[PDB]
Ligand binder design. Structure first.
Ligand SMILES: [Cl-]
Ligand SMILES: [Cl-]
Ligand SMILES: [Cl-]
Ligand SMILES: [Cl-]
Ligand SMILES: [Cl-]
Ligand SMILES: [Cl-]
Ligand SMILES: [Cl-]
Ligand SMILES: [Cl-]
Ligand SMILES: [Cl-]
Ligand SMILES: [Cl-]
Lengths: 155, 155, 155, 155, 155, 155, 155, 155, 155, 155
């Protein structure tokens, strides 16, 4: 399928997609329903980080009232990267960067202990966010990272 | 409780802990047994990212045959940061950084939609790594991030 | 609530809000009057770092004569970050950066001493600037940082 | 008075001071008693960010059992800078950096409105940390920045 | 007085001021003449680094034929910073950066010796450049930095 | 003359010179006295930024009691650079960096207006710091930069 | 198997391995012989980028005459990353960086055209360098990258 | 032949080439047919990294229906560099960067042993991507780097 | 003469000059004839790095058919810097950067040995590139750097 | 021939060779005499940037009275890079960095005009420095860069 070499074309669509989302007062849950795909995937595709299959591109473009160029651009493989500069300053995103700072060594250590030499894939990967109640009062986020284990074996 | 201003004292302890861990053929699962704490927490403390309560610090130092200077240093608040330079190069750790790069915009968007203005905490936070079988043959990692939702409320 | 993925929409609004503020010869204290919120909060929201509740958004848009697009953008959750590049060059802002450079270690030491292992929140946080007279002649600024203590508790 | 051109001599002194503090189980509040100086100043001086007058240098060296070369090194004007790289990774220190990221524009705007063109000094400056109770249960930190206003006037 | 939150408005004004300056074949000496202010101040203000009082702002705007948004923009407190990126590449500007690279240690050492612990202010500051003859034939620049000494006193 | 290829040899010499300076309780004015050279030059040479002529090198080395290596190292051409990282964090040095940030564009403009296309030299350069009294009470520093104008002429 | 959290221990082993290799006048061809593994793998392991299985670890340590702390370190999973700073300066290594700079966009474009959305793995990956004769007189290197195609499929 | 000083003119041409490529649903293999050049070269030229000879430039411009300015721009030598910032974030491109990070030291060591002191050229260089089947199911990419060995010989 | 504070005005002129150069099939050798200046100087001036004498500015703009706003801009002293970011990615430019990396220490050593303490000027400087035949077949570039020696003499 | 993976071994050798050169009061001209190689090559090799053939290594080790470890280390292929950080701060080296900043674009333009698409090699490269008198008094350096033209030819 067709791929994009830079991020500028998908950044403009995301600014157009978000404009329609705010003006029509739509949610990402509403946009992803009837597409057959997960919430995290469809939202990422709208933010220019994934390619939508052709039916989902038409389903989302109908809800937002998007052009036919918008349906074509939503199906293209993007140049991924959502944090300009690599390190964010926005507090909501930074907390996930901070988690990586404290538990980065720990994740590597436990992956090599429980799985072995290799990586936990970010491509053969599924992401899910779930809202749960805190037994001590309040709400909690339970973000799940599901990656296939790729071993590094000697050659 | 006592805090450390630099990371050098805990880096020396971590290099001593790792040397003992290899010579005694110990696992992080074996070091965490009988401490009452989760694997991710105890491992992070050994890697210089957390302070262990005095009972847990004494259990791991006994298994590793460490001095009493090791149990006291294990109980001090460290200067956190496990990734030198913020951005990793090691493939095992980098994959988690890549997850942040693609789904950073997606995580913020869905947190503000499902929770509202605020953050998902990295302090009121739990980490878990679980090994599961992949239906297509092979293994998968199910990393769970459980953080408290802290709202941004007007003042 | 609706969230913004980039800063460009709120940076344009800030230029429009500030242009109206100068043209109406208004102060941030006058714009903050009758909103129920603190001066530091409303000013930050006008500069694109916070979301205003709708009654406060309508009071400021009425004083400045802004359209209904402006009240909607003022209520959206922004992508926070007011210093482009993280490190300021403007002397007024840098002095606050310099305070962090000298007393950064000192703040951590005393936070861990008086409170314990954890953080002083920047989300459960209040800011106040007060003008007081200097006894050697002149005036002084008394900026107050009021943050909730979040402990790091083992898991 | 004598100044140091690099930070290495004072970093070694701080590492010995912290070692003595941990082994004898002393407090920064205990170390600052009988010096006549504030907690924030003496703590910064022990962390290599300020020069102590000789009575304070001798009082702290007696409590920690330091040699005469430590009393002399505590009195020299240091090369200030406590956060290596300018941007911290430790969560406790970062929260103060995050405050600067959100309210940096706000602090400058309100300084120019309440005071005028100029700066709030970091040299004619006092710092204070106070522990207070949160009405929702728990504790809060009340950090105070007290700086002299220096105006920028035409010449 | 009114302050600006970003540098973009003053960068555009500087581009118009410089364009008008070339077309009218005027000097910074001619533009600053009859304003009562020093050459370094008015030139810095025209380059977006200072606020002009309205009598000075109108005399310079009349000479260049600037619009009425420019006279108001010339009177606002800007977001200071004239070297994009902090370190210049242009040889004329770099030479002053290089002077700092070699004599930075010397300036700190001699200020603490001749004045004491503290700084030489950059806000309570006057700048002047004077052309003088070189005894071996040719010209020399005599740049004068006149800053108030602010001491660092214990608190 | 003999040159040094790295900065490590002169960085070690500077630390010994500064330690010796404190133990003899000498000032940079006392060390430069009877050398025939200016205070700023001799101070810079001791701080590893300049080469001393042998008569001056012996006069200063006798006062500090330096080895015979220091006498040769003081006469060798060093690898210049006194601010590690290019941008200082120490407040005393930064104020001079801030002067460069505000008046960098202004200095280039006035150099090209009063002198023409070219630079103000940092090699054919003289530096002097003088203490003067402030009519508003207090003291002031009058730092003078005297550089020869090198024109850029077509080739 | 045991993994390392930092690179410092393997860099010391690598310099000792290289010291022994030069001192004993050994080749990388000889060190990889009798291990059953490819030249590219064993050489990478000696440079701290891979873990050797114990039979290979003893054959290489016997040829260099290394202790038992070396065979244990040679079998540990390292913290990978051979170019300090990410970008090399040595011309031999840089030429490979330049290949990435020119053909980076082309590799992404052709991978998405010939394979589809996804990546070419660097973990399920083999490297080979082969010397072949250049028909224009001279020699050529034929470096082969053999990576598994991992698709990004919707979830 | 004509050279370009910046990448913007070729970046716009690449944006037009890609837009036309999507609308006619053409492949890079289809664009390269009948030009006599390799797939990797022609794709690189369209992505702004190479100059096309006039016959190839016209065959590709006819297929996309481009004007004569596009055929002239396709023949100019560009300012090479396809990864903005040197280090990519897109997963597909980063995998090749990671290959460089792990085997960079290995490539240099083995190049000096098998070839000698010198480089493997990135200019006298050919690139090829080949799709082959993975015996354990799936597909694999076989990217081949063919560079001339240039020795560094004394002068 | 008139100076520019930013590079943006001259970057647009360079883009127009290059477009006219390509459209008229002109060379830098043809543009530099009849100005009396060297090829390297005029070419640099067209690329925004030098100010052209007023007669030369008219001839080059006449040859390219540019308006007079361009020759007026061609006579302005620019903000120099032709490599955005300091380090190039284009291979042709990088090779000259690589020369600096290998022989930078060597140039300083030999300059201080043959000339003495000081610099080789980049302002009192001439550049020439000459095409010569390689005795072993092929062509060679002989770039000549002619800089005045400026001594560092004590003051 | 043996290659080095890091620069530390050659940095130590360079410090001993330079010490011996001063202690024997020798010049780089004297050390290069009787080696058959050019001044720039032998000087670069002593500064850790080139490998000397063993006859040249033995004449230089004999003149400086070095052990056998020096003769072996001078013949090893180093990890090249003489400017730590890529960008120098020492004025003598920076002037050559500044030359590249101004004339970088000009060199690429004239190389593509006089030679064509390709590079001027830094491996098939000669460096020479010659001292000439300035006609109006003073001395000049005439640095000559002699690089082979390597064309980029389509494949
Ligand atoms: Cl992956
Ligand atoms: Cl948090
Ligand atoms: Cl927080
Ligand atoms: Cl201040
Ligand atoms: Cl100041
Ligand atoms: Cl100079
Ligand atoms: Cl992979
Ligand atoms: Cl090459
Ligand atoms: Cl110069
Ligand atoms: Cl080359």
């Amino acid at each position: 399928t067709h791929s994009l070499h830079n991020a500028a074309p998908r950044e403009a669509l995301t600014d157009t997609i978000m404009a329609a989302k705010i003006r029509h007062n739509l949610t990402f849950e509403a946009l992803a329903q009837g597409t057959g795909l997960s919430l995290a995937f469809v939202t990422a595709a709208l933010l220019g980080q994934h390619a939508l299959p052709e039916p989902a591109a038409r389903t989302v473009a109908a809800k937002l009232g998007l052009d036919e160029e918008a349906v074509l651009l939503l199906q293209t493989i993007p140049l991924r990267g959502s944090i300009p500069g690599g390190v964010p300053t926005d507090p909501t995103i930074y907390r996930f960067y901070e988690m990586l700072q404290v538990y980065g060594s720990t994740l590597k250590a436990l992956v090599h202990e429980q799985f072995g030499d290799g990586i936990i894939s970010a491509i053969n990967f599924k992401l899910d966010i779930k809202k749960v109640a805190d037994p001590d009062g309040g709400e909690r986020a339970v973000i799940t990272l599901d990656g296939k284990y790729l071993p590094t074996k000697p050659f």
